[PDB]
Amino acid sequence: TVIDQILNINALHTVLRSLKNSADSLERGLIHAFMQTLLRKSPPQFIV
Amino acid sequence: FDNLRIYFGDDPSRYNISFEALLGIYCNKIEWINFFTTPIAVAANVIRFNDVSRMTLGKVLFFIQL
Amino acid sequence: FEALLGIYCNKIEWINFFTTPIAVAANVIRFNDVSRMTLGKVLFFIQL
Numbered sequence: 001t002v003i004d005q006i007l008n009i010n011a012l013h014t015v016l017r018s019l020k021n022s023a024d025s026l027e028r029g030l031i032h033a034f035m036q037t038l039l040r041k042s043p044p045q046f047i048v
Numbered sequence: 049f050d051n052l053r054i055y056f057g058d059d060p061s062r063y064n065i066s067f068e069a070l071l072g073i074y075c076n077k078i079e080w081i082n083f084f085t086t087p088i089a090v091a092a093n094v095i096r097f098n099d100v101s102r103m104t105l106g107k108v109l110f111f112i113q114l
Numbered sequence: 115f116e117a118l119l120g121i122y123c124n125k126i127e128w129i130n131f132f133t134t135p136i137a138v139a140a141n142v143i144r145f146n147d148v149s150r151m152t153l154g155k156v157l158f159f160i161q162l
Contacts, residue, residue, distance in 0.1 A: 010066040061124045072115035
């Protein structure tokens, strides 16, 4: 029909797009948590 | 239905359109009054003529048998 | 009924972990039961 097709297609694209955005945020969370761990580990240069 | 597929275009990503809300007002065909259809036109005899301004009509006189 | 259209944008830039040079500090290995891991430890045997 009319409008229902396009609301269906946009709902499918909303689900797929939000999954892609969440996967990107998991990758950047890996970046940030690894950087967090390095900053917890590293003593400063004058001490070393 | 590619005539109807204006929406979401020709690109898999970065270009899809939707709508939040909608709105509708139409406009009507107004009512219908033709002269010879309406019943006032019985009282009138209507003569088509080309130039009432250009020739002058008076003394329309009627000859009556009694 | 005519619609009040809106348009989405789907370009979210894609960060692979191994593209960025944080992964030369990193060394990442999948292991599907790290949620069940209580304590991981390594053991070093130094002799002088």
